[PDB]
Design a protein around this ligand. Structure first.
Ligand SMILES: *[C@@]1(=O)C(=O)N([C])C2=[C][C]=[C][C]=C21
Ligand SMILES: *[C@@]1(=O)C(=O)N([C])C2=[C][C]=[C][C]=C21
Lengths: 187, 187
């Protein structure tokens, strides 16, 4: 059975951090649902790229659970994710079932907001470190991609391929990740 | 005056190769128009990400000329660009005025289709080399980003940041490109 990914798309999400994981995961044969936080309508990302979600989050939640829940970054995107009771419920459910949770850039700050994965080693964008570390509930890492417990984190647009390929490896194995990687012309 | 970029978005475009340059160029303060080849409606990219263009190509052409015309890749996207008389006209005009033309992955094959920049050194995705080189009208390069005459080319999703930053450097200078690069957390 194909693995399934939920990518939660809020206004102000970093569009590179949204599209790179969606694309790379689809290349791996993962069934990806791009779910609009606010509903079914198109989402204005941080740099004004407008993306049409596959579904509302409300509708996508009904089709859960998912093998991974992915939280893109962007400060304002992450803030919207952090303020959402629906996001809280999804992440709590995912944590309770020991499923993978993946977040990049400022995205991991939504884990703090929703009290998810406390005690884990995490990374973030450098500019989001202080927010993430308020209260010392996580252990900070400068690795480009970090994985600890349920929790897979990464730093920025320039770590998005690595982040996406780490998701692929977690879900579909190292050989699939390598096969998906080769045609991308990565460094 | 801000520099201006036209990014031509066709069905089957590689969404990473579309979004990374749009985003990075906007970070550099370039005014970017994402122009829909087919009209104003949303565009289904190669991996099913749906992007809403800023304008139709028909409308964006009226607001030309641009400091750069950017052609994303994706085989079917590039084919659509190659078949378009509107694209032909835009690229011919840009070449005639000695403006920058930038293409990635299979995107450079549209330059061949429209007889643009013959004699230039170019790169492409490895799988698009034979198509690009039919007739020996260009000189092939394996560099991740290649620039020769008017013509800036690059290889794939994994060279998209380098490609975008090379555009930024060409338009806004090396220091702006460096400033935009640093917060991205690139390797
Ligand atoms: C991330 O996308 C993000 O969330 N943050 C705070 C950031 C800063 C600079 C560049 C990228 C990003
Ligand atoms: C490019 O986006 C493209 O145009 N081509 C042919 C390709 C092949 C593999 C991976 C990326 C790409």
């Amino acid at each position: 059975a194909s693995k399934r990914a939920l990518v939660i798309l809020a206004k102000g999400a970093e569009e590179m951090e949204t599209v790179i994981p969606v694309d790379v995961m689809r290349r791996a044969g993962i069934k990806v649902t791009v779910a609009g936080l606010a509903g079914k309508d198109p989402v204005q990302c941080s740099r004004d790229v407008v993306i049409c979600p596959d579904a509302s989050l409300e509708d996508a939640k009904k089709e859960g659970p998912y093998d991974v829940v992915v939280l893109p970054g962007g400060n304002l995107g992450a803030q919207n994710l952090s303020e959402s009771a629906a996001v809280k419920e999804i992440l709590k459910e995912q944590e309770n079932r020991k499923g993978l949770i993946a977040a990049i850039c400022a995205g991991p700050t939504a884990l703090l907001a929703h009290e998810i994965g406390f005690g884990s080693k995490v990374t973030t964008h450098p500019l989001a470190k202080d927010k993430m570390m308020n209260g010392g509930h996580y252990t900070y890492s400068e690795n480009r991609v970090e994985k600890d417990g349920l929790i897979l984190t990464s730093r920025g647009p320039g770590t998005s391929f690595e982040f996406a390929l780490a998701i692929v490896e977690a879900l579909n194995g190292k050989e699939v990740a390598a096969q998906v990687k080769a045609p991308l012309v990565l460094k």
